[PDB]
Design a binder for this molecule. Sequence first.
Ligand SMILES: Nc1ncnc2c1ncn2[C@@H]1O[C@H](COP(=O)(O)OP(=O)(O)O)[C@@H](O)[C@H]1O
Ligand SMILES: Nc1ncnc2c1ncn2[C@@H]1O[C@H](COP(=O)(O)OP(=O)(O)O)[C@@H](O)[C@H]1O
Lengths: 450, 79, 450
Amino acid sequence: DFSTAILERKKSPNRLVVDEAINDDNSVVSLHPATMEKLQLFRGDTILIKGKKRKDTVCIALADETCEEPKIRMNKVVRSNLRVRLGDVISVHQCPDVKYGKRVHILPVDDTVEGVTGNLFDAYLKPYFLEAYRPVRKGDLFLVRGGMRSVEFKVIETDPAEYCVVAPDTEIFCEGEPVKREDEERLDDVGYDDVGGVRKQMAQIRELVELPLRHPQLFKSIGVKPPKGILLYGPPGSGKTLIARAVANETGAFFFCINGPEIMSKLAGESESNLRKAFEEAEKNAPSIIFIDEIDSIAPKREKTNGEVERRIVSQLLTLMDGLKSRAHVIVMGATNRPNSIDPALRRFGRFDREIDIGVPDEIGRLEVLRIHTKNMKLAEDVDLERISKDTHGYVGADLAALCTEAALQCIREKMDVIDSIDAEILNSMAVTNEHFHTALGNSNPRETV
Amino acid sequence: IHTKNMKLAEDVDLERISKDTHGYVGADLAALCTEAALQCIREKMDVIDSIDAEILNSMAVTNEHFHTALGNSNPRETV
Amino acid sequence: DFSTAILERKKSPNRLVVDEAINDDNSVVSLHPATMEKLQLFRGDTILIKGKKRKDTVCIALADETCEEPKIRMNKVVRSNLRVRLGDVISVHQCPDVKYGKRVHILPVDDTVEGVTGNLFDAYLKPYFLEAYRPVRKGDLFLVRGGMRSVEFKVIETDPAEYCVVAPDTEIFCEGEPVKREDEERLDDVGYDDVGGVRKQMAQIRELVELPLRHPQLFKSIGVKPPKGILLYGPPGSGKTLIARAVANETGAFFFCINGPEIMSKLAGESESNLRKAFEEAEKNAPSIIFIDEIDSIAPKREKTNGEVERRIVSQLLTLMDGLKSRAHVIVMGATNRPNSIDPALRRFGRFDREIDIGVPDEIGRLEVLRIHTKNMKLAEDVDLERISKDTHGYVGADLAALCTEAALQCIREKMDVIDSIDAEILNSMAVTNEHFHTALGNSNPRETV
Ligand SMILES: Nc1ncnc2c1ncn2[C@@H]1O[C@H](COP(=O)(O)OP(=O)(O)O)[C@@H](O)[C@H]1O
Ligand SMILES: Nc1ncnc2c1ncn2[C@@H]1O[C@H](COP(=O)(O)OP(=O)(O)O)[C@@H](O)[C@H]1O
């Protein structure tokens, strides 16, 4: 039949799976060269991608031999501008009517420009569009990095209408009161691109969570019950909380965070009531991820429990895990730096079945972490992030994140004298030097045996 | 027991898996089957959406799916 | 002056430093493309390299952007055929008179063909020269891998005389009694190419030893005293003994091996006499490397010493280390799997100043080790050494080496029925399958915390 032929032909090489981008560019999508040959698209060509919630965007298509044939590489900005997530399916369409822009009206989002002063054009939009020939579509939201922060901007209007390429003859209008956020999450929200040095561990977590959280109705047909509990192990500041938030944001899963001390600070009975209500809310707003931080505060070993009501909380957690069904679509993530202090009853089948060890990052892993916390920072040529990673042996994710923030403050004090209060165009121009990173290394507070 | 509702390839050797899975309890072996089952779902099925019965009944779990499940497993007796 | 102008012009781009080869080929040397442009040599061209002891060879020159401009990449066979070692200087010269071979007489070395039977041509030389167009020079020695071993062959004669390229019309003569080894070390001797999974650790050791052992007269002019003692740490079978033999062979240093139990098995007084004589011999035959294996057998902690004559041996070792001078050109290498059981007095400045931790190899490091012990083995396409390294988590160098030898025996039994005794042409044809590696994995006897 007519409509049946439409729906069954949804296996066209024009329908591709959303994958991660190697190069973080808001205007560039990467495809396999055999896929672009099938779809008759040339490198550099602007394509129209249609996503979910009847939303669409225009991007530069680029050939990548590392990109899978049925997949498409796109960054978090492009992904959001299509109302999609990694693993979803979009359809790529030819875009031959992309005329250069006559004038574009762009405004920032208030929650990203809190405290920011001065002209946003010279600090952000000017170097952003400069000789880049960026495709721009009305209603889009993009992220610009620089000046110790990141600003989110909205495309208010385009001339010609709906979409145009921002050329050197395009007038960029960015005056007026910042726009207020509406039905869209922050582009600065933590994603997989914000977690470094745990490539293997991230892939493992992703495999376990993506199917139950992205396709929950799939296990209704299959008789296979997926994992419920995952135990993240690793020293403090190794990104356990980060990985959890990244996974929840990237999956669209409802994120409920239980904190070990937060539960244990409450009265007798109030801690278990809070513990139940946390599990209840997650089931109601499922697909969900319950993140139990410092899980050793709650549920320690029966030897280390020197309290009557404390043993009542360990038992409450075990039964909440047992009482949780696969059909509930809730994944519980526990985190501890003391895996051997945790009660062994949690490791039981039906509770915390799988365990991921997030150790200390190696030279390569540290360089990745250093790149993440220098994203919104202007760096000098005298800066060598490869050399810093070579020296910072025994540093965790937080130790490296603190080194960047300290080198950033050392740069603020050293370069800026009396202002009062700084404006964006001056913050975006000051560069963090190797001397600022050396000074931060000298005042730092950061081992592995067989 | 945990391959009863599963289509298995001729390349599958449950005798060889039992020879290798020394120190595995009932749950460890049950988890190995469910993991090899999911590895088969992902590897064989691309984009459906949601699967229907006649297609699920046709996909066979291979020795490669059981090898991949063995590589990611978390399983002693003295006198 | 005339002869002064010759000697001072020894900074010609034709004089290059001997570096390691990425690709192990007895006929190929790699140079930088800017160096070949300076020397007017094209890729594929046969060049004449002159080394030490008035020795020379002919190789295929190839362009490599990873090769340093003043360096040359060559394997251990080419290196030996020039009487040179890594770091030495050779001179590359144009070779335009390389005519194809009419006939070459090649014979194996006895110590490599012990127990081997059948025609060596069909098993080794035939697939070795096949469509390879190998430059061959008289007096040369080369290594051919296959049939669970490696055979060393000598180039007895060439037609045209001295050197020729072995083409498909070249007659290869290999009949007669094997030649006896003369003034040349075994090509199967352990080298840096035989040690895998310790890239960073090897580079560290090499930097510390190469200058004092390759250029000992250099520190006579400089007032800098180099390291004497190095402590290698790591579990049993992680290649500590291997690294020591590799370093000694690659440097040409005299190798004296002290064994912890060997010393401790001797009578009271005989152990210290042996310990002194070991240090004395090394000084006499210097540049030398003293390798003290199981250093914790000798010299354990003063608490763990429950013997009077045992404490006399620990003290003997400390004074022998103190009594050793930089001017002696002897480097002492200690090895232990129990670094915390070793006497802390050894770690003192003047004794064991530097410490190298050779841990357990990662997925990449294990794959390297697997490649090393499959060098002389025929492998099926069904073999996936990448997958074996993925599975063999927690395996050390010896564990992986044993897995190969077991899969090799499993192949011998499974493929060969009743022979008696096997000959070379049949051994070279039998391939080790993934089933042989699975069977070896099933019968194996192989942890890291923060
Ligand atoms: N793997 C990492 N990559 C990048 N940043 C990291 C990483 N690990 C930690 N950080 C940074 O340091 C902080 C450490 O806090 P956290 O995630 O709570 O660590 P943990 O939960 O392991 O104790 C994070 O908020 C993040 O900004
Ligand atoms: N890093 C390695 N690469 C390759 N082979 C190795 C490695 N480590 C060990 N082996 C192999 O296994 C054997 C282990 O013995 P050994 O070198 O004495 O280990 P260790 O001294 O650390 O106890 C070596 O002879 C070698 O054949």
